[PDB]
Ligand binder design. Structure first.
Ligand SMILES: CO/N=C(\C(=O)N[C@@H]1C(=O)N2C(C(=O)O)=C(CSc3nc(=O)c(=O)[nH]n3C)CS[C@H]12)c1csc(N)n1
Length: 265
């Protein structure tokens, strides 16, 4: 049925596809390799912002953090323009979500403190939401480079979709803080050609992307039908058959999204 098209898309692009849509009151759950482990990549930056907000009052957003050029390890379109001025935590939240800024994600992890530069505290945050499967061990850019089969810095479409459901649709955050997280994801600038490109234009899409080596390309989203019904969609992919230098395929994540839309309609 639907698993034959996902398995078909896997064949067309030479990839491994993981899909999960948590069931609503009227629609059942969509699952394709939903419980297989995939690599977080940049998708952790969205629930990471929720950890910082959950721990501190809104006044913490105005605290300024200064850094040096030696701290810039990865793609950081915004952090590279502020080495002399510094950035406040709120701006680091903005950069980490809407621009996938890697340095801003590393600084926010250090704000969580603790061993591993904050990775153990971040894993602790996911456990508080009920996720006992996911784990973050390294920072940018090392967390995108773990070999296949290595369970470090991994999650599942099942686990990540339910985490995002609580932050956007649930009560994981108070309403004022919940408003800040959704707005940033709503004005994200990196996902134009993935889940957004698969749904019709009159469906609202907010998302956070992820990309790494071994052809890894992820997108996590909450979408709204024209009538206003919300759905959470997790799509993850890798192409380990082509090794470290595998080229990611954004078209695979658009096709899979369209398949999901034809079922939810
Ligand atoms: C939703 O994204 N769509 C985009 C897009 O990527 N736009 C960006 C976005 O959100 N932008 C923002 C900002 O962060 O506010 C800005 C702010 S840029 C900026 N403001 C400052 O105050 C400053 O000191 N320095 N800089 C550089 C404008 S473009 C961009 C787009 C590009 S072409 C097109 N048709 N759409």
């Amino acid at each position: 049925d639907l698993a034959d098209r996902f398995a078909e898309l896997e064949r067309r692009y030479d990839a491994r596809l993981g899909v999960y849509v948590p069931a609503t009151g009227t629609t059942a759950a969509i699952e394709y390799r939903a419980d297989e482990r995939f690599a977080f990549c940049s998708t952790f930056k969205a629930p990471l912002v929720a950890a910082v907000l959950h721990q501190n009052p809104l006044t913490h957003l105005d605290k300024l953090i200064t850094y040096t050029s030696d701290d810039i390890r990865s793609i950081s379109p915004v952090a590279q323009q502020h080495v002399q001025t510094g950035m406040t935590i709120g701006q680091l939240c903005d950069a980490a979500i809407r621009y996938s800024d890697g340095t801003a994600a590393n600084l926010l992890l250090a704000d969580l403190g603790g061993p591993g530069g904050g990775t153990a505290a971040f894993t602790g945050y996911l456990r508080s939401l009920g996720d006992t499967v996911s784990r973050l061990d390294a920072e940018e850019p090392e967390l995108n480079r773990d070999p296949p089969g290595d369970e470090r810095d991994t999650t599942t479409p099942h686990a990540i979709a339910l985490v995002l459901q609580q932050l956007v649709l649930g009560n994981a955050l108070p309403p004022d803080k919940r408003a800040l997280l959704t707005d940033w994801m709503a004005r994200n600038t990196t996902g134009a050609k993935r889940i957004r490109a698969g749904f019709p234009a009159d469906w609202k899409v907010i998302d956070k992307t992820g990309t790494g080596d071994y052809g890894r390309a992820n997108d996590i989203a909450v979408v709204w039908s024209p009538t206003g019904v919300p759905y959470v969609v997790a799509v993850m992919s890798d192409r380990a058959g082509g090794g470290y230098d595998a080229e990611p395929r954004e078209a695979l994540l658009a096709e899979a999204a369209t398949c999901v839309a034809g079922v939810l309609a």
